[PDB]
Nucleic acid binder design. Structure first.
Lengths: 56, 99, 134, 99, 237, 51
RNA sequence: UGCGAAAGCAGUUGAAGACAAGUGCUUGUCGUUCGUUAAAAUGGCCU
């Protein structure tokens, strides 16, 4: 995906209706990007527990 | 008030001033002088509820029989106590979790 | 060295001096030494309250601070020693916690924007690399 | 889709739509915009004479009502105004502030 | 849509008397003009308040603003200008060159930035990308990001020159929310082609260390959101 | 999982298998955080190309 | 509780009387009043 975006970037700029054409890519990235703060919060709680029983 | 409308039960605060138990329950027959009872709430209340919360001693509902032998007192903890008015003997019914 | 720094910190905490912040910000502290100090050398609720107040004020006055010793101190403090910090119900301590909350809240919104900018820069690096190669 | 693209957050949002469907009147906070539906963007005129698509008002818009294709009622937190779209002129304004 | 705007068919106060009194007031008399105008409107607050709806007529604003500019083109501006800058129904036409005329006076310039409606994106972005860096940069950034669409901001950054874009980039790199959104808009504006390798590498390192510190601060945020057989004991009797 | 950590955090210091489960779920969470960050970066790249 | 976008930002719960329990004293309670903007009676849902 990233190599396609890098190599064919100018053609993607030139073509219009890019969200409509790449609609699946946008939503697939949106879900993963939206899940981030909950993952970070769970990471911090699990850091607390693991560090506590590691010191103990 | 009973279903036929001949009997009236009421619970009153005045027993707190005039007696050891806080509240008094009085059953009066309206149209004639057949039925008259007055008893403190402390006799009805269980001996386990003094250590508990105030929900266990708070009367949220009452019902009185048409023939006047039964008095159902429902509390804020979800317990229904049916009192035989002739002998002041209670029976406990527990299904309700809330009031 | 580390024991001398810990003794100086204990003396400054006892004397309520302002040098406790300098002792915490000193580069003599390493992470196992920080963990050992937090595990053993703190028993006084007043001294723990004082070090928490100065750490929280120092972080709140500059949340986007490149140094990591003070955030490491706060992280290990909250990780290992939270319960007595909840028991301390001082109003100024609660207000300081709210201020530190307000200072640290903003970086949550920033992180998606910074990640997007980093992605754009990553594309620009690899496009320049392709243009240079061919 | 019309992207928000703002750091501006406001619950004072009203919409109106012309009966032929050509124009959408979007009142957001104090601004009021006219949008061409076909482009779903802001209305721009080639002549660009006596046609302003954005209205800036005194307070936040509560209601936008497009009566006919001509008359546009805008209720703010202070005043209730009628604007004639063809004329581009405010017919009359009333003071709703003491209520 | 075609017929819009093209029709061929065509506490009360005396605004005309207020304009006449302000005209009779002498030029460069800031105190006299302010006293007469505030006595005519009869509201105490220097900034605009919800009380005075009736002054919001536009022709009064045009005549008063023209009289102010004529009277104090060279002299110091009165508090009447401050009140009109706080006023929401400011005329659209004056904002085209408002900032240039009030650039010399910093207090009135800042008041126009933070309160005056309809400051155009042209002069706003030009003043932001100016090399003055007089710490009003945050207010200008907040103003443009709050009041203008991301597409239009990007389109105006397309028009703006590459050198000032560069200078803004090393200014950010040397050294926040509005700043990062602005940097994202600047990157979108310059696009694929034009960015130098050295500046790009410094910007990459800067963004990487900010990502590290941001993730660290979110961690701290969520941290704040977070019978033996034989026992030998002493007895006192 | 967070409610589990809140209620039963003391039994981690005793039970060894729960510690192994916590460490495995930690590694999985780190992998998913990396995937989410990568998706956000590609979303920014897509925004640069679309705009 | 007030305002505000969801984020948040400021702000706040005082008295009086009566009763109970413990031991005149202490503490709690309120089918009490006045003032401020301010868990737990083995007890789970029909055919």
């Amino acid at each position: 995906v990233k190599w396609c975006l890098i190599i064919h970037g100018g053609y993607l700029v030139s073509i219009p209706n890019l969200m409509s054409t790449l609609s699946s890519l946008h939503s697939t990235l949106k879900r993963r990007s939206d899940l981030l703060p909950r993952l970070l919060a769970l990471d911090a709680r699990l850091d607390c527990t693991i560090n506590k029983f590691k010191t103990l | 008030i009973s279903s036929n409308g001949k009997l009236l039960a009421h619970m009153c605060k005045d027993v707190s001033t005039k007696d050891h138990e806080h509240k008094s329950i009085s059953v009066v027959s309206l149209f004639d002088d057949s039925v008259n009872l007055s008893f403190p709430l402390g006799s009805i209340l269980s001996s386990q509820t003094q250590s508990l919360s105030y929900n266990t001693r708070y009367v949220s509902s009452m019902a009185i029989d048409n023939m006047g032998q039964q008095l159902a007192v429902g509390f804020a903890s979800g317990v229904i106590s049916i009192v035989s008015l002739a002998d002041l003997q209670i029976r406990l019914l527990k299904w309700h979790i809330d009031s | 060295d580390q024991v001398e720094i810990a003794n100086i910190l204990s003396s400054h905490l006892e004397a309520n001096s302002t040098e406790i912040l300098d002792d915490l910000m000193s580069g003599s502290w390493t992470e196992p030494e920080i963990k050992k100090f937090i595990l053993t050398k703190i028993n006084t609720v007043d001294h723990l309250s004082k070090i928490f107040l100065t750490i929280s004020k120092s972080i709140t006055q500059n949340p986007w601070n490149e140094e990591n010793l003070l955030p490491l101190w706060l992280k290990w403090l909250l990780t290992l020693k939270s319960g007595e910090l909840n028991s301390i119900k001082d109003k100024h301590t609660k207000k300081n916690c709210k201020h530190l909350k307000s200072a640290l809240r903003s970086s949550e919104e920033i992180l998606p924007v910074l990640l997007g900018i980093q992605g754009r820069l990553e594309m620009l690096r690899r496009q320049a690399k392709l243009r240079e190669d061919l | 889709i019309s992207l928000p693209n703002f750091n501006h957050f406001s619950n004072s949002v009203s919409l109106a739509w012309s009966q032929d469907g050509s124009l959408i009147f979007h009142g957001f906070d104090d601004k009021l915009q006219i949008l061409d539906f076909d482009t779903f963007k802001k209305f721009e005129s080639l002549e660009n004479t006596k046609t302003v698509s954005e209205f800036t008002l005194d307070s936040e818009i509560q209601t936008v009502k497009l009566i006919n294709d001509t008359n546009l009622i805008v209720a703010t937190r202070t005043t209730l105004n009628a604007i004639n779209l063809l004329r581009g002129q405010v017919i009359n304004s009333f003071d709703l502030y003491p209520f | 849509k075609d017929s819009l705007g093209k029709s061929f068919q065509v506490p009360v106060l005396h605004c005309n008397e207020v304009i006449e009194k302000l005209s009779a007031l002498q030029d460069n008399d800031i105190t006299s003009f302010d006293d007469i105008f505030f006595k005519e409107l009869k509201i105490k607050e220097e900034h605009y308040t919800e009380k005075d709806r009736y002054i919001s007529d536009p022709g009064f604003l045009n005549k008063v603003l023209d009289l102010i500019f004529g009277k104090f083109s060279g002299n110091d501006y009165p508090k009447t200008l401050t009140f009109l800058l706080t006023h929401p129904l400011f005329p659209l036409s004056r904002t085209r060159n408002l900032l240039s005329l009030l650039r010399d006076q910093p207090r009135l310039f800042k008041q126009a930035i933070v309160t005056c409606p309809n400051l155009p994106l042209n002069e706003l972005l030009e003043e932001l990308f100016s090399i003055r860096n007089r710490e009003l940069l945050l207010d200008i950034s907040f103003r443009i990001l709050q009041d203008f669409t991301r597409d239009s901001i990007k389109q105006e950054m397309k028009k703006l020159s590459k050198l000032d874009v560069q200078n803004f980039i090393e200014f950010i790199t040397s050294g926040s929310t509005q700043l990062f959104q602005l940097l994202s808009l600047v990157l979108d504006s310059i696009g694929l082609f034009s960015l130098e390798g050295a500046l790009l590498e410094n910007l990459t390192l800067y963004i990487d260390k900010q990502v590290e510190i941001a993730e660290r601060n979110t961690e701290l945020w969520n941290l704040i959101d977070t019978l033996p057989t034989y026992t030998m004991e002493y007895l006192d009797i | 999982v967070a409610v589990v950590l809140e209620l039963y955090g003391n039994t981690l210091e005793s039970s060894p298998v729960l510690q192994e489960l916590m460490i495995d779920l930690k590694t999985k969470v780190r992998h998913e955080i990396h995937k989410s960050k990568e998706a956000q970066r590609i979303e920014g790249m897509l925004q640069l190309l679309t705009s």
